[PDB]
Every structure is written in structure tokens, then in C-alpha cells.
Point group: D4
Chain length 155, copies 8
């Protein structure tokens, strides 16, 4: 039932998108990967979002755009359910592209998460408030992350 739409601004973001998709798969969550720019292909992004919004199933969008991230806010303002911003990494200007993801106007509320695997985790825990299968799979994952540390310690 759940769907995550992973929407990136450029094919050059694919490496980052696929890290998120891989991790969604570990949690049993269906995803779609799509490409569309809020600067260059604005009407194509709008028509694509109308198709997804029309589907009667619980959904999240994870929005990926490097440089000045117009995409996350654009998507977030169009759709009605929650969204997650997960920009690809950059060291340009000491990582200052990050501000274009953080500094939203009033009424625009994408969830910002830096790491791709953490973005996928957040999606899974959003669904888990009402989805017992996903909830069970997040529980197993997080406990295993905690076990690794305790096991590393005892060694």
C-alpha cells in the first residue's frame, strides 16, 4: 500500500537517489524514481505530481536537488501530504547549499534529512505510526544498529 516517490532534479542525482531506493527496499516499501527540475521543467513536474496525488494510497515524496534546492519547496507546496528533502552532498562554499533546503517560507514544511539511508528511515517511521509491518521492520533495523555498537564495545 505505501508509496514513496523519489523525485530528483537531474539524472546526475541518480547515485544519491539509488541509495535511498535501496534502503526503502530493505524496509519493504515500494518506491518510484523520477526526474524533473523546478527551474527547467516546471509544468512537467506539476503534471507528474497531479498523477501521484490522484492515487488513493498513503504516500511520501523524497525530493533531491543539488545546488540551490528549489525542488523540495516546490513539491512540498504543491502536494498535501508530507515530504522529505534529501539533497545530494556538496562541499561547494563549505556546504552552504544546505541553506536552500532549510530556509522555507511560512506554510512550507519538508522534512530535511542529510543522509540518504536516514531519509529512507524517516519515511519508514512516518508510515510505521499506522503500518505494523513497516513498524516491525524499523524495530528490527534500529535494534540491529544498537546491537552492533554493544557488540563492538564487548570486543
Amino acid at each position: 500500500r505505501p508509496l514513496v516517490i523519489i523525485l530528483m532534479g537531474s539524472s546526475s542525482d541518480m547515485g544519491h537517489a539509488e541509495k535511498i531506493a535501496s534502503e526503502l527496499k530493505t524496509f519493504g516499501i515500494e518506491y518510484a524514481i523520477r526526474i524533473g527540475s523546478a527551474h527547467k521543467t516546471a509544468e512537467h513536474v506539476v503534471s507528474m505530481l497531479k498523477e501521484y496525488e490522484a492515487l488513493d494510497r498513503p504516500k511520501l515524496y523524497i525530493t533531491i536537488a543539488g545546488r540551490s534546492n528549489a525542488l523540495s519547496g516546490f513539491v512540498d507546496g504543491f502536494v498535501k501530504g508530507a515530504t522529505i528533502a534529501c539533497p545530494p552532498p556538496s562541499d561547494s562554499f563549505a556546504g552552504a547549499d544546505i541553506y536552500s533546503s532549510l530556509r522555507m517560507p511560512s506554510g512550507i514544511s519538508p522534512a530535511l534529512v542529510l543522509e540518504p539511508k536516514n531519509a529512507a528511515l524517516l519515511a519508514a517511521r512516518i508510515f510505521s505510526l499506522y503500518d505494523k509491518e513497516i513498524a516491525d521492520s524499523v524495530k528490527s533495523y534500529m535494534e540491529s544498529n544498537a546491537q552492533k555498537i554493544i557488540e563492538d564495545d564487548s570486543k
Copy 2:
């Protein structure tokens, strides 16, 4: 049915917490406001989170801590459902406290949102994937934000 636990590190964060609480109220979402520090009162935060986790109702935590935000990551790692980090504003070191909210390890995934009203919005849209009442109230709110702009334009 939904519950948002608003957990701040210090009573001096209350002004910021109350902005979030006010806005949750506009969406018909029950909240609890609580105080506890991840540096100073770690066992008290743990016992408080066990009580909330024990409740069989869909829940989110919104975690508020100024300066170096240990709280959001601490809470996020303990609980199983999603959390939101919403630190109070600061201009110390050009706002560099923000990094302590962004830079999470692997497996820790709080949603970072700067504005208090946007944090509340995000909570509401998380619930709205499965809650028709809240979904209807987010729809009305966001459409009214969009109408304001179009109305400002026509003037």
C-alpha cells in the same frame, strides 16, 4: 487519537514550544508539553519516553533544544516512530548551532524543520496520510495560505 509530545531541553525554550502547540491546536491535534535535558537529566528523559512509547496511539515527538542539540538525536534513537527536530532560533556564531541538528549518525533520522509553525504543519501532514480529519484541515490551511498570495497579487 493522534498525540504529539513536545519535549524541550529547558523552561527557557517554552516561548518556542508554545508556538508549536498553538499551531497543533489549529489542526485539531492533541499535544503534551514536557521538559527534560539530554545533558542534565538523561534518566528522567528515558523514563518519560518509556511512558509515551507504551501508549497504543499514533505519535510524534517534536524535540526542542538550543545550543548544541543533543536532545533530538537522543529521543530519536530511543523511540521507534518518527520525530521532528525544531530548535529555537539563534544568531550565535552566525546560527551555527543548526549543525548540531543536521549532522546525525547512521540510523538516526529526526526531521529537521526551522519554523515552529512549519514543524506543526509537518506533524499534521505525517498524520494526514492515514487521518482524513487532519488531512482535511491541512488542505484548508494550505489553500488559505495560497489564496492570501493570489489575493495580495490582485490588490
Copy 3:
């Protein structure tokens, strides 16, 4: 004659827009002031741009958005002719909102200018390559600025 569309993301940008509009008026350049957000009212911005794009007169767009400026690149990718990004000033995060105006993808080329009077000056000077009336007006304005400096020096 030339037209400048001053498009801002919020009514709260109006004081900044008015400074740009006032300066354009001193060069005798017609303007229009409009409001629309790239986040909250994308289709309204799309619809509005299609209207301005259909006018047969030389035009520039001056795009104003505080915080994370999605508006300038959005408009820039939509319209045919040049645009100018002139964000309102902010000292939050030591002014780091500016990077959201600077960091464009390939094929998006808004001119970034900080001061609202300088954004109006650049717009004038874009038209001046072909518009002699605006060129003379720019010339008098720039010569005037230069003369004030020289007079300030000689008065010491």
C-alpha cells in the same frame, strides 16, 4: 517601450520591490509589480508569466524572494529573455540565503545583483544597448555619481 516585471514571492517583500520600482521610474522605465510564490502558488506564477511573455515589447523580470530563493531560477527557466535576481537583505545565518540565488544549475542564468538601486541600474543598462533614450538617461546618472565623488574630494 521596455517593461520590467517586478515579481516578489510575498507581500512582505514589498518595501524592497518599491525601492527597485522607484529607481526604474527615475530612468523612465515602465514597471509592473506582482506577487507569487514558487513554493505556494506555482501554477499562478506559470499562468502570470505566460501573460507577460505574450507581450511584444522588450522585457526583463526582476525576481524577489527572501529565504531560499526558488523564485528566480523558476522564472528564469520559464521565460525566454533575461532575468535579474535581487533578493531582499537578510542577516540570518550571516546572510547565507545569498547562496540560494547564486547556485544555479546548467542553463539557468539570472543576473544576481544585491542592491535594489543597482538591480534597477542593470535593467536600464540591459535596455540601453538598443534604447538611446535609456542610454542617455543612464549616462547622465552615472556621470552624476562620478561628479559627486570628485566634488566631495575638491570640497575637503
Copy 4:
């Protein structure tokens, strides 16, 4: 009255950045010239060169290239009548803070700042396109193609 872009750089060391801009102007069919002159070390040489270019009866732009503390963009911009574009070479020294020397102009100095060399060439083309129809056709072709690659990437 054919368009001209003068690409003026502060040092021979900037040549590779200048060539990326020249190359892209060539795809738009816009004539350019590449010149060298320092606002710090060869001020009178720059003034003499600008006076020569300024005398030409043709629509012109200057794209100004200087690394480190960019004195050149403001210097040229304050001297010439028509619009200019600042396109500094990339640097990660001090986390890119050389950029502030291109951004922070006094009143009356209005160079258009664009980071990417291809985007500086595109802004140049789109400035002429307000009046030059052939350049406008070439810009629509270029920007349409950028957009089609994206749609095409998605559908693939």
C-alpha cells in the same frame, strides 16, 4: 550593429575559464574578443582598451573575469556605459569567500554576477535576445533542448 562580447580577464592564468565562456557564446553565434588586463597592475592599459571598445557603434557586453579579490568587474563596470557581467573563476580558498568581492558593489555599480561560465554566456545571449530575434531563436532551441534532455531522462 552586430552583437559583441568583450571577455576581459585579469591574468593569463584565467584563460581556461575565459575559453569556456567564449566557446558557449560561439554556439549562440555571438562574436567575442578575449583580452587581458589587471585593475591592480595595469589600470591605464585597461582604461585605454575600454575607450577603444566603447567607441564601437554596436550592442556590446563585457564579461569580466578576475580571481581572488575581484577589482576588475567593478572597475570595468564603472567605466563603460552598457551592462556588464561578472563571472569569476571558481575557488575554494576560504570556503569560496572570494565571491563576496564580486557581490558587494557600491551604489551605482551594477555588474550582473553569474557563477557558471556557460550560464554567463547564456545571460549574455538572453540580454541581446530582447531585441535580436535570431539570438532569441537560438536561446529557445538551447533551453528547450535542456528541458527535453530532462523529460527524456525521466521517461527513460
Copy 5:
């Protein structure tokens, strides 16, 4: 005798921890190296600290956490005696992870030291106020560093 507990948030911090541990060994100071995250294994850290806190010997904790350092303030608020924060080096966001170690609330007082050899030196020097054996060892180490500089100068 003195004990230093070197507590790091992840196995990936081990190379940094080992540099601190090696340096302590040159001052003849006993250490223990442990792993626990303030985010992922809070109760394990609580349980571990209660064990070390029950030892009747002078102790310091040296706390190592990359990224947003929750670990140092968490341990510092829990234990009675002093602690030292020594985060692993990072150049992400121009090193801005450092602020997560600096910006403590009221009543949380870890000593921040950047270099792992300097964190070990501070720990030694904390003990040295009361431990003559560590004091002589510190004295020889510091005099030695000073002599190398003077010898480098005289050799020129």
C-alpha cells in the same frame, strides 16, 4: 592510580581514540577504551558510566563523537568529575561540527581540546596538580618540546 576512560560513539572513531590512548601511555597513565552512542545506545552508556563512577581512583573521561557531538555533554552531565571533549577531525561544512562540542548549556563543562595528543596532555596535567609522578613526566615532556624548538633554531 589515575584512570582515563576513552569513550567513543562508534568503532569508526577508533583511530582517533588510539592516538589519545598511545599518548596517555607515554605519561604512564592507565586507560580503558569503550564504545557507546548517546543517540543509539543511551542506556548502555548510562549503565557503563555507573560502573566507572563506582571506582575509587581519580578518573577523567575523554569523550569522542564525530558529527553532532551529543556524547560529551551527555557523559559530562552524568559523571561527577571533569571530562574532556576531543572530537575526531572533519572538514565537512568547513569543520562546523566543532560547534556541537563548544555550545554547552549552563552546568555542563567538558574541556574542549582539538588535537588527540593535546587531549592526553590536558588529562595528564589535570592529574599532575596532585600526582608527582605524572607531574615529573609532564615536565620532561614539555621541556623536551621546548628544547627541540631551541635546537632547531640554533642548527640553522
Copy 6:
């Protein structure tokens, strides 16, 4: 053999910051002295003062206070045998970047950096507390009370 804290500041202008640190040490029952000396302007005066304090047979710490480029913390730290604490006065010049002059020590120089004056006093108390039981009781009282205010705020 009673604890002593020497609070050494670079200028009389730092006095208000020094007093906040002295006040808090007083609540812990720790004797202090407040002195003035510049590592830039009065180097020999500082060396002479440090030699006097260093000769005392009692557990001692130096808390060093210098605004702007902090030469003083490293200067004192390299001179004395036992631990030191850097606690610079607050500044928002250059977005607080004076802090890097307290953080970036060479090898062999290990002052403890703490931002808040009350926290620098607490770190001092907790350094002595490893060996001094009365100070440890006073620290538990203090930190327990901080924690109780919080629990008490929540339950109210």
C-alpha cells in the same frame, strides 16, 4: 595545599567576564586571584607573574581570558606546568570567529576551552574534585540542583 585559581586577563576591559568566573568559583569555596597582563604588550610582566604563582606549593589552575586574537591562553599554558582553562569573552565580530584563536593550538599546548564563564568555574571545581572531596560534595550539590530545577520545571 588549598586549591587556587589564577584568573589572568589581557586587559582591564575583560574585567566583567572575569568577575562572573570569580563569583562562581566563590560559590564552590575556591580561592582565586584576578590579574591583568597582555601577551602582546606586557610579555615579561606576564612571565614574571607566572613564575611567582608557579612557585606556590598548592594545587593550582589558570583561567585565561583574552578577547580578539587570543595569544594569552597558549602563552600561559606553554609556560606553566599544570592544567589551564581558556575562557575568552564573547564576541560576535566576524560571526564569532575569534573562537578559532582559542581552539587552534600547536602540539604540546593544551588549554581546556570552555565558552561560558560559569562553566569554566565548574570545570575548575571538577578538576580539583578528583582529589578534593569537599569540592566534590559542592559540585554534586550544584549539579543535582541544576537537574532538580529541570525535573521541577517539567512537573510544574
Copy 7:
């Protein structure tokens, strides 16, 4: 017969220039105060600098320009002897205007000093290498600064 030429970019810099001139006057050093912009009035600056350069006497230029400082490099590359950059203070972009004064090309060597009174002191101390009178006046002023600190101390 030393001369220090204080050249600023705008009359709005006059308050900063007056602090420098005042301090120069305390050392018995003659100054001239002048206004000219490297962006808006380049030829005016060149002709001004020609007049001073033609004076057969030991001279320094102190160059003041806010925002992107094109002036100090421009002056420095033109004149023969040493120059000093002392820009006015700014909090814009976390004080990032400073980079425009720091980041010079090869062959351009203005001395950067932040504080106006310290810019005047460096000027004195430059001349003092060969001017015995200024060496006496610098010596008494610096000694007087040291003595103030020692007296402030002795009162505690």
C-alpha cells in the same frame, strides 16, 4: 617631511579616515585626506596619484574602501612605495568584506590592518626605521600602553 595620503572611496568613509588622521597627528606626521573611487572615478584617482608620486619625499598611502575593496590594490599597483589598507568595519555577511582586502594577486602588497589607530601606528613605525623623531614618539606611546596595563594590574 613624511606624508601619509589617506585616500577613501566615498565621503561615507570620512569618520573612519578622521580616526586615522587624528592618530597620525599625535605622532607628528603630516597627512592629506582625499576621496576617489576605483569603480566610479578611476581616471580621477590615477591623476591624483600622479601628483603625489611626483613629490620627492617619503610617503605612504592609507586606503579605505568599504564593501568590495578594489581601491587598495588599485592604489598599491600604481604607486612605488608601501601602502596600507584599512577598510571600514562591517558586519555584512559575517564581515566577509575583509576577504576583498586580503586576497591580492602576485606583485600587490598592501599592508592590511583592521583598527584605524593601528593603521596610523604601523605608518609611524614604517617611517621610524629612518626618522629618529617618530621613533621617539612611537617609543613613548607604546611604553605608555604597556605601563597602563601594569598599573591596571597593580591595583588588583
Copy 8:
């Protein structure tokens, strides 16, 4: 008989110091190279500076210390005539070590220059106010830099 004393904080600075010395040698200026740290060897620096100060001849000190630069202010506050700070380059914290060289107290006026060859040029140009031979050598070198740029241009 000018003397430039190049004083560095650590032998690890030697590569940077050698670039300065090399360039001084091209202007016919005698230099000495010395090592001493303001943190670890303060008395050694003081006694060294006493020896050079006692020389009846025109001198400058060029002070090199990486990380938190305590050295330039320390040297500058001690000696009578002008000094120059030229720290080694660093990318640590986005180059924020630079602030430790910029942010001086009242009465401390080291000239800050980034590039080693420019530090040597400022040294020359300081002496050139009264030394006719160095003025000739500076003049030919600066003219030669200008001519290179004009020749690079003329080839395009």
C-alpha cells in the same frame, strides 16, 4: 644595511619562510631566519628579539606562525619598528586561522599580507621610502609585472 628578521614558530614553517627569504634576496635585502614559538619558548623569543633590537640599523621582522598566531602580536608588541605577519596557508576551518592574525588589540600593528612573495615586496617597499637602491629594484620588478600582462594581452 637593512635587515629583515624572518621569525617562524616551528621548523614545519620553513618552506614558507624560504619563499619569503628567496624573494628578499632578489631585492638585495639581507635576512636572518630564526625559529621560536610564542607558546612553548617565550623567554627564548624575548632574548632573541633583544639581540636584534640592539642593532643600530633599519630592520623589519616578518613573523610566521600557523594555527592560532600568537607570534606576530607578541613580536610586534615587543619591538620598536614595523613588523609584517605572513602566516602559512591553511584550509582548516575554511581558513579561519586567518582571524588570529587580523584581530589585534589597541597598540599592536603588524602588517598582514598573505602571499610570501608579497610579504617580501612590502618589506622592500617599506625600506624603499629612504633606500634609493631598493626603490630602483622594486621599480624594475613592478614594471616587469605590468609589462608581462600587456605582452600576454598583445598576443591575443
